Amino acid sequence: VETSVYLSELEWKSASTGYGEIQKDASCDGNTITLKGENGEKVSYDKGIGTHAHSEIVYSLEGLDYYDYFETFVGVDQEMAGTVASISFEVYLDNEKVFDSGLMTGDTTQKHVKVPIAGKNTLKLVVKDGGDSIGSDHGSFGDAKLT
């Protein structure tokens, strides 16, 4: 088995997005995924999932009970720096929310997610539209993986 498994290596049970394709290892516009770093500069990610509010992406963890955590960084993909981008990220394990970023705009520093998955069957990623419109709502999951 792999020591970690990127979500981009897995097939989802279902996936919706507000634009285009859910992109494997790229932003929803097909660029290298970038998030806002603590120093104000971009942080680039080789692996991850790029999507667009409103998005719900559901993965089965059947045959993946090997792993302790789901880990990822989340934020507005910095291809939309300077825009009206406004989103939130939620992560569910089975039927409960385990992570909620609250509102993130283009300048909001990326957030790290590390949630335990032991004993759970289903991982669901949600990108919501910040309560305005989906305009510029490009949300990326940097380094998203089971580990």
Return residues touching Ca ion (CB under 5 A): 86, 129-130, 132, 137
Query: 17 or 86, CB closer to Ca ion?
Result: 86
Q: At closest approach, how far in Å is the CB of 146 from Ca ion?
A: 29
Phi, psi of 23 (to 5 degrees): -95, 135
92, 121 Cβ separation under 8 angstroms: no
Q: List the beta strands (DSSP E) in 7-121.
A: 14-16, 23-24, 33-36, 42-45, 48-52, 55-60, 69-76, 86-93, 96-100, 104-105, 111-116
- Nearer Cβ to Ca ion (71/137): 137
Q: How far is the CB of 130 from Ca ion (least distance, A)?
A: 4
Min CB(136)–Ca ion separation in Å = 7
**Cβ nearer to Ca ion, comparing 31 with 105:** 105
Q: Which is nearer to Ca ion, 8 or 51 (CB)?
A: 51
How near is the Cβ of 90 to Ca ion at its closest, in Å?
14
Distance CA 132, CA 143 (A): 28
